[PDB]
């Protein structure tokens, strides 16, 4: 009955008896973790036991239930430290992630690696498997070294071992190997740690940020489909005006990624078929457990998931991504529209945006936006009632306060968009 944080020193927040909505909780969480108002949209709530995400509009009526506050919408090579991968950036009037969000992503990466939510890739061969295990030890060294740098302690100061900083499956794999192999691994680890902390760390003056980035990039390369969600289905439909391809008799996978959009494939006993990138979707309809995604070319993808909740999770992912790369003020399905965005466009309120865009929007025309620093006020301060900074009259809603007191352009560019 609480929202959990992967950060080291962040107590969870217990929920009392009452009605809640996922978005408000995500705001509280974003506030708790010093997350900027721009990056708040990247985060969502994950239901640990059912393995199902919550859409922003999902109502929680309160039993034991533990929800993880985590970054859901991810873009490979956001760090731009990859030459074989396309760069990711944000429109200027520049990087995707700030430090605050990056820290949380790092914590998240550690938790995922250890608890195997981010499982290691399968070995193409025995040596490759060994090499994967080696890289795991490397990751352990990275984690421990980061912890060392943060606490301003050195190697003689720290007591610990590699065992709680690797995937549990590998650890348990190791504990069943003979003594000599366990000894060997532990020694080799200790050597890696020693060398890294004696020479490399200061020879190149490796910062903490650098280690985080390294860790996460290694996560991208070392684990299965990192920063991606895969959905199973036994009934898949890909159709157009003159085509109607139905796949049936869970045998089919549909993957959603932030830099390739929606893809699908026959679940293996090779490569993914691209359906659509996000900007091409016009709308998404849900009927029961069935999701129907409509593209601009009148093409359609339709799939039947396990239930309604999973459909909500799926579309909420797709929708969030659409907001991330297409239009920051439009939504694709009413079933998962965040009340804020609805009330936003309903009252003609933009999103927090860089000023140049505001002044430009004002010049080529009163523009209403959101505070680029905090969630508490609209650039007018809203509370649990709407009013101005110096005002005393609590107008029950924005519309009322505005009545007694321009608009956002569809598919308009901004720093709220990721160029991929």
């Amino acid at each position: 009955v609480e929202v959990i944080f992967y950060l080291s020193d962040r107590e969870p927040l217990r929920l009392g008896s009452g009605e809640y909505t996922a978005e408000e909780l995500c705001i509280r969480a974003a506030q708790a973790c010093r997350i900027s108002p721009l990056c708040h949209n990247l985060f969502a709530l994950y239901d640990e036991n059912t393995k199902l995400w919550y859409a922003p509009n999902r109502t929680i009526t309160v039993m034991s239930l533990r929800l993880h506050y985590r970054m859901r919408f991810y873009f490979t090579n956001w760090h731009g430290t990859n030459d074989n991968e396309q760069s990711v950036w944000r429109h200027s009037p520049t990087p995707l992630l700030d430090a605050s969000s990056l820290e949380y992503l790092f914590a998240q990466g550690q938790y995922d690696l250890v608890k195997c939510l981010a499982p290691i890739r399968d070995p193409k061969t025995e040596q490759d498997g060994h090499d994967i295990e080696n890289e795991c030890l490397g990751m352990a060294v990275l984690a421990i070294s980061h912890y060392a740098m943060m606490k301003k302690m050195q190697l003689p100061e720290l007591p610990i071992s590699y065992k709680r900083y690797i995937p549990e499956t590998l650890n348990k794999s190791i504990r069943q190997r003979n003594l000599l192999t366990r000894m060997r691994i532990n020694n080799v680890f200790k050597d890696f740690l020693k060398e890294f902390n004696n020479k490399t760390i200061c020879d190149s003056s490796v910062s903490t940020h650098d280690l985080k980035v390294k860790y996460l990039a290694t996560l991208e390369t070392l684990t299965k489909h990192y920063g991606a969600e895969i959905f199973e289905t036994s009934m898949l439909l890909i159709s157009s005006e003159n085509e109607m391809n139905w796949f049936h008799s869970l045998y089919y996978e549909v993957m959603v990624t932030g830099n390739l959009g929606i893809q699908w494939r026959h679940k293996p006993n090779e490569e993914w078929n691209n359906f659509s990138f996000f900007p091409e979707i016009t709308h998404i309809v849900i009927k029961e457990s069935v999701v129907s995604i409509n593209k601009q070319d009148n093409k359609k993808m339709e799939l039947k998931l396990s239930s309604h909740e999973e459909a909500l999770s799926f579309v909420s992912l797709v929708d969030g991504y659409f907001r991330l790369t297409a239009d920051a003020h439009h939504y694709l399905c009413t079933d998962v529209a965040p009340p804020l965005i609805v009330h936003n466009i309903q009252n003609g309120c933009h999103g927090p945006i860089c000023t140049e865009y505001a002044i430009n929007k004002l010049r080529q025309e009163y523009v209403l936006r959101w505070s680029c620093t905090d969630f508490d006020n609209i650039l007018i301060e809203v509370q649990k009632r709407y009013s101005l900074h110096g005002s005393d009259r609590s107008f029950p809603s924005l519309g009322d306060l505005m009545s007694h007191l321009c608009q956002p352009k569809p598919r308009e560019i901004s720093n709220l968009l990721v160029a991929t």
């Binding site: 040596q127 890289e135 490397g138 003979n178 192999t181 890696f192 490796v206």
Partner: peptide, 21 residues
């Protein structure tokens, strides 16, 4: 079976995860 006969008793190589500029 042998105690030492497995990939871990190859010559230890620094993992690429710890490579820096």
């Amino acid at each position: 079976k042998t105690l030492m006969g497995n990939p871990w008793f190859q010559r230890a190589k620094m993992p690429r995860a710890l490579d820096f500029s």
